[PDB]
Amino acid sequence: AQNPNCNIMIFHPTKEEFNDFDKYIAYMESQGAHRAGLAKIIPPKEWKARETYDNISEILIATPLQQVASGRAGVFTQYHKKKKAMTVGEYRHLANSKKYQTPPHQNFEDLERKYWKNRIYNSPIYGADISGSLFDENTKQWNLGHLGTIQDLLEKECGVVIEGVNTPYLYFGMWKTTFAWHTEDMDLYSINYLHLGEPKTWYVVPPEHGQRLERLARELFPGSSRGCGAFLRHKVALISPTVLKENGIPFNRITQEAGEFMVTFPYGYHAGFNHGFNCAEAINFATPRWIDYGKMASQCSCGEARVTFSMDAFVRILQPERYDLWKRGQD
Ligand SMILES: O=C(O)CNC(=O)C(=O)O
Ligand SMILES: [Mg+2]
Ligand code: NI
Ligand SMILES: [Zn+2]
Numbered sequence: 001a002q003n004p005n006c007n008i009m010i011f012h013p014t015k016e017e018f019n020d021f022d023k024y025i026a027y028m029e030s031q032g033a034h035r036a037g038l039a040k041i042i043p044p045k046e047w048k049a050r051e052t053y054d055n056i057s058e059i060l061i062a063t064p065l066q067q068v069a070s071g072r073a074g075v076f077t078q079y080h081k082k083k084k085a086m087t088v089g090e091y092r093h094l095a096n097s098k099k100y101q102t103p104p105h106q107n108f109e110d111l112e113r114k115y116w117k118n119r120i121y122n123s124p125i126y127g128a129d130i131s132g133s134l135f136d137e138n139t140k141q142w143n144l145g146h147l148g149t150i151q152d153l154l155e156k157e158c159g160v161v162i163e164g165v166n167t168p169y170l171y172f173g174m175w176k177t178t179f180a181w182h183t184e185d186m187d188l189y190s191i192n193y194l195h196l197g198e199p200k201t202w203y204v205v206p207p208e209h210g211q212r213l214e215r216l217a218r219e220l221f222p223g224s225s226r227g228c229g230a231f232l233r234h235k236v237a238l239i240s241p242t243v244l245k246e247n248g249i250p251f252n253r254i255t256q257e258a259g260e261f262m263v264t265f266p267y268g269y270h271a272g273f274n275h276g277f278n279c280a281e282a283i284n285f286a287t288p289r290w291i292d293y294g295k296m297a298s299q300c301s302c303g304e305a306r307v308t309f310s311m312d313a314f315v316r317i318l319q320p321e322r323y324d325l326w327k328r329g330q331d
Contacts, residue, residue, distance in 0.1 A: 003032025037268025057089030164310030173274030198276030
């Protein structure tokens, strides 16, 4: 069995190996990458997402989200308070302000310590979940706006044509902006490219151990657990590395820098934080190996998790028994 300790693997494809996305994902899995839940891909040196980032300041962040924490330093929830619209140029200025900027630090490890010690006492603003792309239309390799769609994968594997579309999202981050512990909708893969700016630190639990994290989460967030049998689908709960170590939950950590891709694998729980002003682009995708995870994915039916148009068909076709109850939650 390849990669049996479920370590995060880092790949350095050549320009020749960067041509066929599906084939390279399948190569990574042949080496065991998926067992970690997360992999890093450093693009060939010849490759670029686009020529420059000089003309992005007029992109609008229609609903910036203020991430307000409750709890204790190592075990907290966050809620998202909607703020007034602002442009990317306005947001970057805010991120760089004395109130919001990255503090002086020695290295990534010192910054990680400061994040866990102090996150809860501040409410950073995240420009998350913005439909769009920063890939140049002429970039032919690993262009997250030109991937094969999940609807076409389901059709190719299962023979059923379904409605729905699959497009990327932009994330504009600042110091302490946070992504809570989650897997993807329908336990899909995701791919994330850090276009510019400061790093993003990731934590991940191997897929084979996801239920261990769920059991800990039910213990640490007991009201939330009673409210919903899949409450980590709400994407609001944080648990520190110190707490995970104290409770024997297997995980790994890695920092992504500008110019690098990350892939999350089916049922790979992940969480993390941004180091300073940055812009990432991400999208879900599927492979043939995903189908069985989609069939087994938990669902939120309490009504909190509220998701895309396109998830309807996935539930309907892969989880017909759950369909009725899940749709009541969506309506
Ligand atoms: O970058 C973020 O805020 C969150 N991204 C993801 O969870 C992902 O790419 O799967
Ligand atoms: Mg612009
Ligand atoms: Ni994710
Ligand atoms: Zn729920």
